[model samples]
Target: MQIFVKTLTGKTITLEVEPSDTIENVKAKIQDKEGIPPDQQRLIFAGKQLEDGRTLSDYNIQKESTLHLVLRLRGG
Candidate 1:
């Protein structure tokens, strides 16, 4: 299966995934694609963090699941 990922920068990324893959796996792929480290990255879906210990199934994500790597902006 495949999922669509849209970064906060307006880039659209496509990834192939398995039903058993966790959200962490997806996050890692996004990290690799965007070169964003865990400490400085946040995979947000439906306004929540794509936690390291959760699966797409846990969040009811489907094949067309779309998420955003929302940059945590600080120091306004």
Candidate 2:
């Protein structure tokens, strides 16, 4: 299945995934393509932050669904 990811900077990316793939795996792919570190990546779907351990199917994510990607804020 293919899902769309929308970055906070307004860039949209297409990711190829499987239902059994974990959210962490998705992040890895995003990191590879978008140059964002995994730890710095925050994924949101359906208005909720996605946990690394959860699979796409576990969250009921479907084809063409949008996943919002944001950077984790840090304080100096």
Report the number of backbone clashes for model 2. Answer: 0
Candidate 1 residue pairs in backbone clash:
none
lDDT of each model, Cα atoms only? 0.76, 0.92
Q: Candidate 2 residues 1-76, lDDT tens each? A: 9999999778898999998999999999998898888998889999999999999999999999999998985651
Candidate 1 — which residues are off by over 4 angstroms?
73-76
Clashing pairs in model 2, backbone N/Cα/C closer than 3 A? none
Number of the top TM-score candidate: 2
Supply candidate 2's per-residue lDDT for 58.
93
Global lDDT for candidate 2? Answer: 0.92
Ten-residue region with minimum lDDT total, candidate 1: 67-76
Task: Candidate 2: list runs displaced more than 4 Å.
Answer: 73-76
- lDDT of predicted model 1: 0.76
